[PDB]
């Protein structure tokens, strides 16, 4: 109800009546409280609403002292009988004043006002008007000041607005050590955004709230300064100093250990300096004016480069991210806040896994926030879904994260079935033979899905064999099964090389040079798409400088960029290709991959491909030769897909191909030295060419047949009508 | 002094005295300043105390116009002599309100209130802005609008579109 | 000779003389032409120089309508007859205004000034157009946007060039 100051003045009125041996309390006794002390700082006595308003404080002093002498000496027992209606009314009026003034507590000024409004000198010896406006003016110009300049974190903390923080006790102590300096009063927190800089300032506030602060700072209070009053609050040229200088001086003395702080101190460098608030502050740094700032490391760098002065006042305080275990500790401290915020229970394992998840899948975010996001997001997820529950650790988190960050890998299937149990079948259905390539694909994904693959390495395989054997097709089909979308594959022509390639590859352009589109094909796409299948079109012909660079993705997945940042791959499957082995494939020694032969190939590949790459690669995969037996399946597969891809079914075929057509293809388009690719030449050269002509001649109205000639031919529906 | 929102209204009021070529600014010109243009955020006219107070602000504008046409002269050279003692009182009243509110500047909220204290319609069942107590009930919802800066996508959606 | 706007108005004015079957086209019909219909885009009527000046567009209209009633309605042979000497004067005066204003084609606005000068709705319930100061200021404030930022290629095409 009352401020401590208001209570003091009222209390003094009461106790002065006791000390002066006076019966019922009168307006006189509150006036006695007003003149209770010689201290000029006491507004009720010298730096008064009277003295700086309209009348000599002595006039009033003598009104009161005359009256105090005039009231007769009583037995101590009644010395302060009651406030009666007289002081009751003054206090009630002080409350009416609060309502008029919109003041949350009764001020000593409300007591000064209310008393003065009711009061009049009781005797002819002194006269003075109750100059209400003068006393209000003087009251308004005193004490109330920071609500116009900075947000009072400490009182708001007393009011429960503070978020307590843990695990930063040294960082908090560091700000204390700096704040405890006698000369260099200015600390600043420097680090990554999301590192916990504001959190540390609030940590200081927590230290203040629990009064765990050294005498120099023991009475401290924190206030959030800048942008509003320092920028929005400006229309005139001197507005960088009006209000700003004002508050700097308002807080230098008496009013406890006021410490302002800046959360976004980046501004305080000035756009071209020009003392845009920025210089006046350090200009006054020889004393008081204790302020703590906060900036990111790069913003720090920028304000340093753009100023050269605040840095002589401000102590650089480095803030490091916590370890995963430490992150969990803060998560635990924060856990109940989240359970409350969302009305859901959270498992300790939720917190544990959130933190390690973040380390694994959120490289662009710091652990404090990243882990918290996984928690607060999961909780929010449930809060929305709550119309139905609680948060369940990795269950909720893996799904939640995958939904936002990508990586469905962690969701686990409703049924593993086609999801890597029967996948070898499904892959063998799309492509024929080459089961080891198929197994490699499945295994790559299975290890990823199971959390077993070495996390530092993307699945990586190099595919050897004769072009036309399905090496690209495999990669595309992998994307097919990986995303249920074959166009999500990333494919780079790795053979387009000379040394002049930086940006075309993950290296990017370099900032400071023309062009700021970097590694678009790889770096930008990788940043955007957390995983894919990356196909390198004949690494056999790629320049070795690039291959050496690609190695970095191949293993130890970290990826740099000319932007000064990194990408850091993880879950992208990479596929490299070569036909070196064609020199051995053309031996035609069985459809199966032969021992020794395949080794001569891989040996030669190393000779013509840095083994350093191959010494990191998950494995080299070799394709089976497409024997006619393989063809006997492939032809149907391809004719089916080829037809299905032909726009819409306004015609298409009945396809009475039977063995006769199949064999023709196996006897005519079947080049032992070019895989199935020449069968496609046959198919288009014969089947589609005739078809196109029949369509062109409008000899087909709907459907179509394939009729073996002894070659192939088509039928006529309308007779060239 | 006055801030920009109050100054806009005050400027308009004086402008209106000149728009009507009148020698002095009268309460009617200020009421006319309150209702200038159909810009919703204008508490003096549309997102106002009047609608909240269950009054028709356009009807009130008709009242204002009925009063404006009764201005005794529109003579050019005689125009723009004084802000008038009548409004001296009103602006002084606004200053009194600032003291009552501990306010460092006069906002349109204050200038509205001050005129309202001295305003009238010579009508029993006044179609005037709702009386002062309601003026306070709604004026006190202010301080202690976005449509000026943004499109209400939700409302457009409510309206289909 | 005339702008597309002036032509619209004069087409309408002459049209009105035949719609109401009047003995001659009068200043009243041109005022009525300006009051084509209460279209939101109606520059000479809803957004006009009178409404933003001194008098209510709705009441102005009613006077004009009373005048259209007062001008006798006759049979098709005596109906319409002429543009009238009255408007031969108004439109020639509008042409004089064009020269004063450096504008090659007659603006409907110039017609409003020439027209208004002849007319005078001297009712005790005056609707007489607000005089020239309000009329002109509002006329000068008409639009004043896109043309400061653009070339009207379509008018240019109408004007050749
Ligand atoms: N040590 C900690 N104690 C308590 N809360 C923390 C801690 N570390 C992080 N947080 C949480 O992190 C969020 C605010 O993070 P901060 O690190 O202050 O953000 P910030 O990094 O200060 O913002 P920048 O980078 O200066 S814009 C809050 O939601 C806190 O719950
Ligand atoms: N093993 C297979 N199973 C099913 N269909 C196949 C198979 N092999 C090829 N098809 C055909 O294989 C051809 C694609 O050839 P690929 O071997 O992927 O090209 P490759 O790869 O050479 P690139 O592109 O430089 S690696 C297509 O035209 C398919 O019709």
Swiss-Prot record, chains B, C:
Summarize the record's induction comment.
By heat stress dependent on the heat shock transcription factor HSF1 and the general stress transcription factors MSN2 and MSN4. Expressed at a higher level in respiring cells than in fermenting cells. Expressed in stationary phase cells and spores (at protein level).
Q: Where is this region: Repeat 2?
A: 83-144
**Where is the region Repeat 1?**
2-71
The cellular location(s) given in this protein's UniProt record come to: Cytoplasm; Nucleus
Which domain of life does this protein belong to? Eukaryota
Q: How does it assemble?
A: Homohexamer, forming a ring with a central pore. The hexamer is stabilized by high protein concentrations and by ADP or ATP. Oligomerization influences ATP hydrolysis activity at NBD2. Interacts with YDJ1. Interacts (via C-terminal DDLD tetrapeptide) with CNS1, CPR7 and STI1 (via TPR repeats); under respiratory growth conditions.
Quoted from the entry, the domain comment is: Has 2 AAA ATPase type nucleotide-binding domains (NBDs) per monomer, a low-affinity, high-turnover site (NBD1) and a high-affinity site (NBD2) with a 300-fold slower rate of hydrolysis. There is allosteric regulation between the 2 sites. ATP binding to NBD1 triggers binding of polypeptides and stimulates ATP hydrolysis at NBD2. Nucleotide binding to NBD2 is crucial for oligomerization. The C-terminal extension is involved in oligomerization.
Q: What does this protein do?
A: Required, in concert with Hsp40 (YDJ1) and Hsp70 (SSA1) and small Hsps (HSP26), for the dissociation, resolubilization and refolding of aggregates of damaged proteins after heat or other environmental stresses. Extracts proteins from aggregates by unfolding and threading them in an ATP-dependent process through the axial channel of the protein hexamer, after which they can be refolded by components of the Hsp70/Hsp40 chaperone system. Substrate binding is ATP-dependent, and release of bound polypeptide is triggered by ATP hydrolysis.
Q: What else is known?
A: Present with 32800 molecules/cell in log phase SD medium.
Regarding protein family, the annotation reads: Belongs to the ClpA/ClpB family.
Q: What is this protein called?
A: Heat shock protein 104
- Biological source species: Saccharomyces cerevisiae (strain ATCC 204508 / S288c)
The primary gene name is: HSP104
Full-protein positions shown: 6 to 182 of 908
């Amino acid at each position: 109800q009352f401020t401590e100051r208001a209570l003091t003045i009222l209390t003094l009125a009461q106790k002065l009546a006791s000390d002066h041996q006076h019966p019922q309390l009168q307006p006189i006794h509150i006036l006695a409280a007003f003149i209770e002390t010689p201290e000029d700082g006491s507004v009720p006595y010298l730096q008064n609403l009277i003295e700086k308003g309209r009348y000599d404080y002595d006039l009033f002093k003598k009104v009161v002292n005359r009256n105090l002498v005039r009231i007769p000496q009583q037995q101590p027992a009644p010395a302060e009988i009651t406030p009666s209606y007289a002081l009751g009314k003054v206090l009630q009026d002080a409350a009416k004043i609060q309502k008029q003034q919109k003041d949350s507590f009764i001020a000593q000024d409300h007591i000064l006002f209310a008393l003065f409004n009711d009061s009049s000198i009781q005797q002819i010896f002194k006269e003075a008007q109750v100059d209400i406006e003068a006393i209000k003016q003087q009251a308004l110009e005193l004490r109330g000041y920071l609500s116009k300049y900075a947000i009072d974190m400490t009182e708001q903390a007393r009011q429960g607005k503070l978020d307590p923080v843990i695990g930063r006790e040294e960082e908090i102590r560091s700000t204390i050590r700096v704040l405890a300096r006698r000369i260099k009063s200015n600390p600043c927190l420097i680090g990554e955004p999301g590192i916990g800089k504001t959190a540390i300032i609030e940590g200081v506030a927590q230290r203040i709230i629990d009064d765990d602060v050294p005498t120099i700072l023991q009475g401290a209070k924190l206030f959030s300064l800048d942008l509003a009053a320092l920028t929005a609050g400006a229309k005139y040229k001197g507005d960088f100093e009006e209000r700003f200088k004002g508050v700097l001086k308002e807080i230098e003395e008496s009013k406890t250990l006021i410490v302002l702080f800046i959360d976004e101190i980046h501004m305080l460098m000035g756009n071209g300096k020009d003392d845009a608030a920025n210089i006046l502050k350090p200009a006054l740094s020889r004393g008081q004016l204790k302020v703590i700032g906060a900036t990111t490391n790069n913003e720090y760098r920028s304000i340093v480069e753009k100023d050269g002065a605040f840095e002589r006042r401000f102590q650089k305080i480095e803030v490091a991210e916590p370890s995963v275990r430490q992150t969990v500790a803060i998560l635990r401290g924060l856990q109940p806040k989240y359970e409350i915020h969302h009305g859901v229970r959270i498992l300790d394992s939720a917190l544990v896994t959130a933190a390690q998840l973040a380390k694994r899948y959120l490289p662009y975010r710091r652990l404090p926030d990243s882990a918290l996001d996984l928690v607060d997001i999961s909780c929010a997820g449930v809060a929305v879904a709550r119309d139905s529950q609680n948060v369940v650790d990795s269950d909720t988190i893996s799904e939640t994260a995958a939904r936002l960050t990508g990586i469905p890998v962690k969701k686990l299937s409703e049924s593993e079935n086609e999801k890597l149990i029967h996948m070898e079948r499904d892959l063998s259905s799309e492509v024929v033979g080459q089961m080891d390539a198929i197994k490699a694909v499945s295994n790559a994904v299975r290890l990823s899905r199971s959390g077993l693959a070495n996390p530092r390495q993307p699945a990586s395989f190099l595919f050897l064999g004769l072009s036309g054997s399905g090496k690209t097709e495999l990669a595309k089909k992998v994307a097919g099964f990986l995303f249920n979308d074959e166009d999500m594959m990333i494919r780079v022509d790795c053979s387009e090389l000379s040394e002049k390639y930086a940006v075309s590859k993950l290296l990017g352009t370099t900032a400071g040079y023309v062009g700021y589109d970097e590694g678009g094909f790889l770096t930008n796409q990788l940043q955007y798409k957390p995983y894919s299948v990356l196909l390198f079109d004949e690494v056999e012909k790629a320049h070795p400088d690039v291959l050496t660079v690609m190695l970095q993705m191949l293993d130890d997945g970290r990826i740099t960029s000319g932007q000064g940042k990194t990408i850091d791959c993880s879950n992208c499957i990479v596929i490299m290709t070569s036909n070196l082995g064609a020199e051995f494939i053309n031996s035609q020694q069985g459809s199966k991959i032969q021992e020794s032969t395949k080794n001569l190939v891989m040996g030669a590949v190393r000779q013509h491909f840095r083994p350093e790459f191959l010494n990191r690669i998950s494995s080299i995969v070799i394709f089976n030769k497409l024997s006619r037996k393989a063809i006997h399946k492939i032809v149907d597969i391809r004719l089916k897909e080829i037809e299905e891809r032909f726009e819409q079914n306004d015609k298409h075929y009945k396809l009475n191909l039977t063995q006769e057509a199949k064999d023709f293809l196996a006897k005519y388009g079947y080049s032992d030295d070019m895989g199935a690719r020449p069968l496609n030449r046959l198919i288009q050269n014969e089947i589609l060419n005739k078809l196109a002509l029949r369509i062109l001649k409008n000899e087909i109205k709907d459907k179509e047949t394939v009729n073996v000639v002894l070659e192939e031919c088509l039928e006529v529906l309308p007779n060239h009508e």
